[PDB]
Amino acid sequence: HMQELFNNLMELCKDSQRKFFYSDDVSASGRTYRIFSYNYASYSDWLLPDALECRGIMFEMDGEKPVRIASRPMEKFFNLNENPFTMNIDLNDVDYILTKEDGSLVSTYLDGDEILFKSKGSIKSEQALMANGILMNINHHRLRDRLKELAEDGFTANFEFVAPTNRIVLAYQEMKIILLNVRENETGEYISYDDIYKDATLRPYLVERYEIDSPKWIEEAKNAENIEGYVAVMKDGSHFKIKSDWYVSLHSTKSSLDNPEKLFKTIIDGASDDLKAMYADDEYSYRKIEAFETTYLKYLDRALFLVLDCHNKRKTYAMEAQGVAKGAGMDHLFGIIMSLYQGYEKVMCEIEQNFLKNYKKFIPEGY
Ligand SMILES: Nc1ncnc2c1ncn2[C@@H]1O[C@H](COP(=O)(O)OP(=O)(O)OP(=O)(O)O)[C@@H](O)[C@H]1O
Ligand SMILES: [Mg+2]
Ligand SMILES: [Mg+2]
């Protein structure tokens, strides 16, 4: 049930502050919501219970009690061959593949009598309030009424918000929302693509689908231009993504595998999952990216512990924050501990830049 699921997620947000976290917002109606998301996480983190559902799922709260799963976006999923989840796939068990739109996730939720969108991490993000604007206009009144009845039966409708102002790599003419999928809020079951298609009000918005008969579609997609790629939907309802080399080479920093300050840049932007799957045919470059990956996560772990723990507990702290920084070799994390005296997020921004400058120290041994 839901209470079980809410607990498993709360557990994750205690393990470390850059693995899993949450955040509470309040809505216009005055209701209280809690969003479970994530910042960084390695394959083992994703083995923790229900860790794969800690990407924007949102609970309406009552104090510290979940009352309902107000919004259910997709589970975390990975690129093919990115890690042990997505290696040894029977490509013959791909049901079909879906165009991958380049934009931002927005997911429905009911707030009293109002059907609204939340971005991945917030119900007040720019994308959230614009998506809201879009849904309340007269052109989307048929769809708004259908998503409102879906919410009321407790489903979550998931859209990719695209726009020329919100351009990531691909270039979209108009601002619009594209219906990706629909999820039952409690069980997380997906509505079948064919049911969404039968609704002629939803059919206009629904992401294009392609049938496949040979795994040759992956080579074609890897070698295509001006597309991000595809989301493959398995016969069991799980999903794996295939991005084009073209997209990945444009979404990473330039010369990533050559300049180690570039590779680390790729990692601090969360783009090294696409890169790793791009070099999955190259055992050396594949396992090298994992090295630099672990390095930066090992660091973050240590760093974030020391910075926040110290600042949990006056010139006392000043001299005491020096014992943590110098005691761990990184005197860079001293002005960082000055933050909790000044103001808090804004922090994680600073730990990154400070890593790239001393970066030469952390470069894995043998690389
Ligand atoms: N047809 C589609 N089906 C599913 N997801 C899609 C589709 N088109 C675009 N997406 C987007 O793909 C995202 C997941 O793949 P992507 O590599 O873009 O993730 P990300 O934004 O880097 O974050 P993460 O690594 O945490 O998944 C989803 O957030 C979703 O908004
Ligand atoms: Mg995307
Ligand atoms: Mg990624």
Find out whether 186 and 1 touch, Cβ atoms under 8 Å.
yes
The DSSP code sequence of 76-144 is P--BTTSSGGGSS--GGGEEEEEE---SEEEEEEEETTEEEEEESS-SSSHHHHHHHHHHTSGGGHHHH
Is residue 231 within 6 Å of ligand 1 at its C-beta? yes
Ligand 3 geometric centre to CA of 88 (Å)? 20
Q: What's the Cα-to-Cα distance from 98 to each of 119, 271, 320, rounded to whole Å?
A: 21, 21, 54
Find, among 98, 170, 157, 100, the residue nearest to 131 by Cα.
157
Query: Looking at 19, 100, 222, 265, which residue is catalytic?
Result: 100
| The last residue of a domain, from among 71, 94, 112 | 71
Residue appearing with tokens 């595809």: 230
CATH of the domain at 340: 1.10.3550.20
Tokens in use for 178?
Answer: 């594209």
**Hey, which of 43, 86, 100, 227 would you mutate to test ligand 1's pocket, going by the most ligand atoms within 8 Å of its Cβ?**
100
Domain with 38, as residue range(s), is 1-71
149 in a structural domain:
no
Method: X-ray
Is residue 160 within 6 Å of ligand 1 at its C-beta? yes
Q: Tell me the sheet residues that pair with 115.
A: 110
| The last residue of a domain, from among 71, 91, 107 | 71
Q: 213-225 in b/e burial notation, b at 16+ Cβ within 10 A?
A: eeeebbeebbebe
**Count of CB atoms within 10 A of residue 186's CB?**
14
The DSSP code sequence of 248-314 is HHHHSPTTTTT-HHHHHHHHHTT-HHHHHHHTTT-HHHHHHHHHHHHHHHHHHHHHHHHHHHHHH--
Find, among 231, 207, 209, 102, the residue nearest to 158 by Cα.
207
132 in a structural domain:
no
Find, among 338, 337, 336, the residue nearest to 350 by Cα.
336
47 in a structural domain:
yes
65 is catalytic: no
Number of the ligand 1 atom closest to the C-alpha atom of 102:
9
281 in a structural domain:
yes
330 in a structural domain:
yes
250 in a structural domain:
no
355 in a structural domain:
yes
Q: How many CA atoms lie within 13 A of 229 on its CB side?
A: 23
175 in a structural domain:
no
Q: Which ligand is nearest to the CA of 182?
A: 1
Q: How many domains does the chain have?
A: 2
The DSSP code sequence of 37-82 is EES---TTGGGSTTGGGTTT-EEEEETTEEEEEEE--PPP--BTTS
Q: How far apart are CA 228 and CA 172, in angstroms?
A: 12
Q: Tell me the sheet residues that pair with 231.
A: 98, 241
Is residue 144 within 6 Å of ligand 1 at its C-beta? no
